[PDB]
RNA sequence: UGGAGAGUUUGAUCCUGGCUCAGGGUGAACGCUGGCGGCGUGCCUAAGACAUGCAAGUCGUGCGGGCCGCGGGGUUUUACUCCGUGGUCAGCGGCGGACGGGUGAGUAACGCGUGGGUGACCUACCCGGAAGAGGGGGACAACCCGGGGAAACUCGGGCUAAUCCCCCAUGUGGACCCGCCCCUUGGGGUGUGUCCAAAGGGCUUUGCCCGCUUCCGGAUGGGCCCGCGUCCCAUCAGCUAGUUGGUGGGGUAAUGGCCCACCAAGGCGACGACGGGUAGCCGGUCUGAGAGGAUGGCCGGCCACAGGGGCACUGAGACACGGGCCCCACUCCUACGGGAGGCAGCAGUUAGGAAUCUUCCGCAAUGGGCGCAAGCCUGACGGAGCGACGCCGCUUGGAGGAAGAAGCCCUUCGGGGUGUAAACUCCUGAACCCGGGACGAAACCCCCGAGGAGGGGACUGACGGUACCGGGGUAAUAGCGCCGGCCAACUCCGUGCCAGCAGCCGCGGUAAUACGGAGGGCGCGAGCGUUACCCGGAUUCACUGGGCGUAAAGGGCGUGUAGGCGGCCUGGGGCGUCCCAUGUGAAA
C-alpha cells in the first residue's frame, strides 16, 4: 500500500519536513514519487504551508493514506475540507 | 589572527605607507616619514630585481594587508569574485570593501581597522537593526548600519563624531552625526574609492 | 533466547500439515483419473474429476495451489483425460465436461 | 515499442529456427568516425518460410527458447547470397588462424 | 569566461627527450604546536574472533484458561465452591518478524546503468463498484494425572473453546474443458456440463461500527525478457554436450531445456569466444582548457550476502541477519550422561594495522509494528559525548607612546638592526558570576455537528536553565615550515668530504647566504610541515593534440583474404546525419 508523509532534510538542529507520496515500505529519507509538499513546524518564514491541493485530493481519492501531522497539515490545507 | 604586533612594520615592508594604526600611522610617521623602507637586517642594502611574479605576490600581500585579514578567507572570497560575475577584480575590490569592518571604517565610525574590528565584534556597531557581531558581514544596497544604544553614551564615539566632521563619506556610506546611523548603497570600485594597489596584478598572480 | 518465531515455526508446521495432505490428495485423485481414462470408461473418472476439481479450488481457496496451478491442472487433467476417452471409448456423462 | 531489426537471414540450419545476421552502424564516442558490427539473433520460422540469405524483418518476441528469442513477421528480399557469401568466406578465414 | 611554467644531458647553442618540482584534492595517518563554536565527518586492514547489555512485536472489537484480587454472587453456614470483577502469564488465533538495519566477500553478470516490451505474469496491507453472511459437525493446545533431565527441557494417556479445521447448500461473478464470435503470440464477449464462496465481534444495541466472502477496477511494488553502455592479459585462439534446435510433458505466478523423454545437429569465435587476473554498478565526486583521467565512504537508487556451502516449509511476499533442518569448520557450556551460540544490527571487547569514537539521553518530532482507541514496542530515528578529522566563524586586545631605552645580533666602533616594539597612559571587555530564558507541538484525544466537512476544549521537550536576552566585569594560549636555483627572504660564529643536506641541479676536502647554531627577514596562523595516495602540469598514448631521412620508430620484398575507404551525371529510398514535437532523464 501507499502512504503520504513527512521527510526531514534540515540541519543538525534545523528541522524542515516535506510532504510526499511514497509506498510506505520505502525508507524515511528516501526516494518518493510526487513531490507534493513541504512544511516547517518551526515557522521559519511565512511559507510553511505547502500541499499539492489538486493531486493530493486526487491521491487520497485513488486509495492512499496520510500520516498523523499529515492529517494535521491537510486539516489546515483544507484539502480535507469540502467547504460545507 | 591579523598578524598582531609590529603592524606598521609592514607600512614600510610594502614600501609606501597606509592608513593603519589610525591617528599616529598618519601623523608624522606611519612609522614612515621618519624612515620609510622595509625593516630587517638587510634594511637598505641595495634593492634587488623582484621577479615579475614576486612583484605580483607582493601586491597580493599589500592589498590583503591594508584590508586587514588573513589570506584564507581572502582566498575564498576571491574565488567568490571569480564566481559572482563582473570584471572579476573590480567587483572583487567592491565585494571586499562591502565587508562590515571597513564599512564601519570609511563610514567614519572607527579611527583604525583594528579598532574597527573590536568595535564591530562587540556589537558596538548595529546593522540596520540588530547589533551584528562578525567583522565579516557584507551588507546590501540600502541597509542602514548604526551603533549601539550604549554607544551614544560611549566616549571615543563622540571623539569620532566631532573630529571627523569636514570629511565627506565614501559616496554610498550615508552616515548620521544626528543619530549615529549610516545607510548602505551602490557598489564602489577602483575609482569610487581608490587605493595604492594594481588589482589586475593581484588577480593574475592569485589564480595563477 | 525466545521469540514469537517459535510460534511462527509451530504454526507453519500445522499449516504445512494441512497443505501437504490436501495437495497429495489432489495428486492421487488425478492419478485415478488417468488410470480409468487410458482404460477408456468415463463414469468413475467423472466422479474422480468432480472430487478433483472441488479439491482444486479447495487448494485455490487458501494457501496451496493458488489460482493458476489449480486451474492449470484442471485444464491439463480434463485435457489428457478427454483425448484418451474418444480413443476406444464413448465420451458420455456430462460432468466436468462440456458436451 | 517492440524493437524490430532489419537483417540478412543467415543459415536455415535448424527447423522452425533461423539465424539472423543483423548489422548496425554506430559512431565512435571518442574518435568520431563511424563503425559497424554484426549480430546473430533467433528468427522464429515455424514452417521454414525462410532460407539462404533472404533478408527478412525479425521480431522482439516472447522468449521462444534458450537464447532463441526474436521471431519474425515481414519477409523482405530474396536472392541475396552474395552477402551471406562474403560472411561465409570470413568464417573460413576464422578457421585460418592457428597456433597449434 | 576558461588554458602561464620553470630545474635538468653541452666548452657553448638548437632540437630531441625521460627524472624533478610549482598545483588542487583526502573518511587520512606522523612529528611540532593546539582556545570557544556551528555544521559535518571518523575501521580504508581481519567477510577474524567476539563475553556482557539492548535490537520485534502487538492485539481480550479473534477464543478457552491457570495465578495475584474485589463485590465476596451460592453457601440457612461449613470447608470454600462460584455470577460479576481490577491485574499477570502461556496457549491456540490474527497481521508484522520478506520493512527497517549492516557489509562489499562474491559476481565481468542483464548485476548495474539505461530505453522499452509482458497478446506470457504476480501484488495481502488503504479508495471504487456490483453480488453477498442457511446449517451441521471435528481436532489440538492451555489445562488433568504420572514419569525422566544438569541444562537443553521431553514422552505417554485425558480435557473444552473459538474469525481454529472442515462438508452439503446460496452462486452476480469466477475456473476448466469442448464450441461460435471479433481480435491476432494466452486480447475479449459468448453457448452446453462440473467445481469455488463466506467468520463472526463490539456497543452509544434495533441501528451504527471493525472484520467478512466473490469478482471486476484503482494504488504501488515486483518478477520475466529485450536494444544499447559497462576493466587489464592474444605469452588466453579455439570453446561446448543440456551442449544448438525441435516436437512432446513436468514445474513456475507465467515465458523459457530451468528440468525429463525423444528426435534433428547445430550453437559460438579475432567485430576478440573460451580461459586467467581484478573489482559490487551507479546519481555522481576530485581533478582537468576541453576532451579526458581517476573513482563510487557519507547521502540516494539498484545488487548480493550473513562464519562457508546445499536445502526446503510456512506465507500475499523469503531460501529468509537477530525463523527451522542438514554437513563441515570454530569457540563455548556440564555433575561430563551430553549440549548452547553467529554483534558484516547498536554500544563496547579483542587481534590485525602508522589509523579512526560513549558498553550515553529521549520515544518530546519524524517514519515503521500492531490495536475501536487507550496504548505499548521502536538502538529506524531524533540528540548530547570523544578526535583540529575537514569546511567555515572567532579569540589570544584596541588608542597615543622614542631620532629610538634596556637586553640581544652586525660593524669601517660614528653607529645599524630587532623597534611603536616595550614599560607606562587611557578605552574596551576572552573568559567568567547574578538574573531572566526559549522556538523545535498540533494533531491522534475530549465534546458541538453523526464518527462525515467544519468549531472550541485539553495532554505532549530529550536536547538544556543550553541557544538566547539584560546587567556586571578580568588584558587574557602562538606557534610550525622556509630563507643556495626553481622561489618572496642575508649577514655572523662553530664545523672543515668529518657532521651533514637533498624533491632534481648539488651543498661540506679549515674564509659554507645549503650543515648546527644565533640575529634578522619570507611565508602561514590554531594552525604548520612530512610521507602516503589520485588528477594536473604531461600536447610524456597527441580525439581537439603528436610522430617514424640521420633523434625511439617503415615490416627484407611480394602477394592477395577480410576489413577500411572511394571518380563523375539522374532520380527514387531516407539508413547514418541535421532539425521539429513530447515521454524520460526521481530527489540530491
Swiss-Prot record, chain A:
Reported function: Binds to the lower part of the body of the 30S subunit, where it stabilizes two of its domains.
Organism: Thermus thermophilus (strain ATCC BAA-163 / DSM 7039 / HB27)
Cellular component per GO, a single term: small ribosomal subunit
Superkingdom as given in the UniProt entry: Bacteria
GO MF annotation terms: rRNA binding; structural constituent of ribosome
UniProt protein name: Small ribosomal subunit protein bS16
Subunit structure: Part of the 30S ribosomal subunit.
NCBIfam families: S16 (TIGR00002)
Gene Ontology BP term (one): translation
From Swiss-Prot, chain B:
Keyword Cytoplasm: no
Obligatory cofactor(s): Zn(2+)
Organism in which the protein naturally occurs: Thermus thermophilus (strain ATCC BAA-163 / DSM 7039 / HB27)
Encoding gene, per UniProt annotation: rpsD
PROSITE patterns with a match to the protein in the record: RIBOSOMAL_S4 (PS00632), S4 (PS50889)
Keyword field contains Ribonucleoprotein: yes
Gene Ontology CC entries for this record: small ribosomal subunit
All residue ranges annotated as the S4 RNA-binding domain in the record: 99-161
Biological function: One of the primary rRNA binding proteins, it binds directly to 16S rRNA where it helps nucleate assembly of the body and platform of the 30S subunit.
Family: Belongs to the universal ribosomal protein uS4 family.
Zinc finger (C4-type): 8-30
PANTHER family: 30S 40S RIBOSOMAL PROTEIN (PTHR11831), SMALL RIBOSOMAL SUBUNIT PROTEIN US4M (PTHR11831:SF4)
Protein name (database record): Small ribosomal subunit protein uS4
Entry keyword set: Metal-binding, Ribonucleoprotein, Ribosomal protein, RNA-binding, rRNA-binding, Zinc, Zinc-finger
List of residues binding Zn(2+): 8, 11, 25, 30
From Swiss-Prot, chain C:
Disulfide topology: none
Residue ranges, annotated region (Disordered): 1-26
Cited InterPro entries: Ribosomal_bS20, Ribosomal_bS20_sf
GO cellular component assignments: small ribosomal subunit
Recorded GO MF terms: small ribosomal subunit rRNA binding; structural constituent of ribosome
Keywords: Ribonucleoprotein, Ribosomal protein, RNA-binding, rRNA-binding
A GO BP annotation: translation
Composition skew (Basic residues), residue ranges: 1-25
Top-level taxon: Bacteria
Family: Belongs to the bacterial ribosomal protein bS20 family.
Function statement: Binds directly to 16S ribosomal RNA.
PANTHER family: 30S RIBOSOMAL PROTEIN S20, SMALL RIBOSOMAL SUBUNIT PROTEIN BS20C
Official protein name in the record: Small ribosomal subunit protein bS20
Species assigned in the record: Thermus thermophilus (strain ATCC BAA-163 / DSM 7039 / HB27)
UniProtKB/Swiss-Prot annotation, chain D:
GO molecular function, one term: structural constituent of ribosome
Gene Ontology cellular component list: cytosolic small ribosomal subunit
Keywords: Ribonucleoprotein, Ribosomal protein, RNA-binding, rRNA-binding
InterPro entries registered for this protein in UniProt: NA-bd_OB-fold, Ribosomal_uS17, Ribosomal_uS17_bact/chlr, Ribosomal_uS17_CS
A Gene Ontology BP annotation from the UniProt entry: translation
Xref: CDD domains: Ribosomal_uS17
Subunit and interaction comment: Part of the 30S ribosomal subunit.
PANTHER family associated with the record: 40S RIBOSOMAL PROTEIN S11 FAMILY MEMBER (PTHR10744), SMALL RIBOSOMAL SUBUNIT PROTEIN US17M (PTHR10744:SF1)
Family to which this protein belongs: Belongs to the universal ribosomal protein uS17 family.
Function, in words: One of the primary rRNA binding proteins, it binds specifically to the 5'-end of 16S ribosomal RNA.
The protein's name: Small ribosomal subunit protein uS17
Organism, as annotated: Thermus thermophilus (strain ATCC BAA-163 / DSM 7039 / HB27)
Organism taxonomic ancestry: Bacteria, Thermotogati, Deinococcota, Deinococci, Thermales
